[PDB]
Design a protein around this ligand. Sequence first.
Ligand SMILES: Oc1ccc(-c2n[nH]c3cc(O)ccc23)cc1
Length: 207
Amino acid sequence: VETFAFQAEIAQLMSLIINTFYSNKEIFLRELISNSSDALDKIRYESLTDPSKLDSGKELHINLIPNKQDRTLTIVDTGIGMTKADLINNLGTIAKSGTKAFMEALQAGADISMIGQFGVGFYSAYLVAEKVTVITKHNDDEQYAWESSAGGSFTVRTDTGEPMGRGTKVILHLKEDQTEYLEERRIKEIVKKHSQFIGYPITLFVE
Ligand SMILES: Oc1ccc(-c2n[nH]c3cc(O)ccc23)cc1
């Protein structure tokens, strides 16, 4: 298991998300679904010129899996996936410059719901999760598990867990007071409100 420190700017972004009083937490799901849609667009684009890019899975979709026993909400996509280098480099984002722009926007009057406009929407997971685990598999690399409970560090390890073929699985270990995001009616409402124009099938699993 390798343990890394977040860059100071990303640790600052995470503590702002965790510590700021902000009631509109539901936007985390829109942000993660948007990230999954972007990853699916990437593998679809590569497949237009190289059909073998889909040998690791032809179906392009997003699954939402609530688990009340484990208190987890998992977002699975069959997108391009991330390499080990992408995971270490802030989950394939330009998070240092994105955080800079987002901070300036907040100081000027913007609110946390605009996070996605700054390319750091993944971190909105911390509005509802005490810990986030990311399992990913890119065609050019092995399957890895990234994990962080914030606190300034994250871990990366080769995942010997259930093989995914290709794509990313974001496992949200929800905060005790955020279990409404495991309720079918609540998830359905959020997807309908914020993710109505996502161009891939979103399947909400039942328990
Ligand atoms: O370069 C890449 C960057 C990101 C990803 C990616 N795939 N699905 C996700 C879900 C997320 O919540 C966050 C990031 C991703 C894939 C490739």
